[PDB]
Amino acid sequence: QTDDPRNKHKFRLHSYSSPTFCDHCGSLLYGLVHQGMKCSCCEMNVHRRCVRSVPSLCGVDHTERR
């Protein structure tokens, strides 16, 4: 409850109203997730079974020159 580890994206199913499209398959998030699993670290919407297919590449930010 103090050390911050690092694993795959922190996908988290949110709730807006309609399901968003998937970024791994490009298919609406229907019959797969209540709404959509948005990564609470880099902002990445995916399905509930497409995460096991993602190579886990979280930590993609901008302004990395310095």
Q: Which residues are near Zn ion by CB under 5 A?
A: 9, 22, 24-25, 39, 41-42, 44, 47, 50, 58
d(CA 48, CA 37) in angstroms, rounded, equals 7
* Nearest Cα to Cα of residue 39 among 8, 16, 6: 8
Tokens describing residue 13: 């199913």
Which residue, 13 or 58, is less far from Zn ion as judged by CB?
58
The CB-of-62 to Zn ion minimum distance in angstroms stands at 14
Residue among 64 and 66 whose Cβ is closer to Zn ion? 64
C-beta of 6 vs 66, nearer to Zn ion: 6
Distance (Å, whole) CA 5 – CA 8: 10
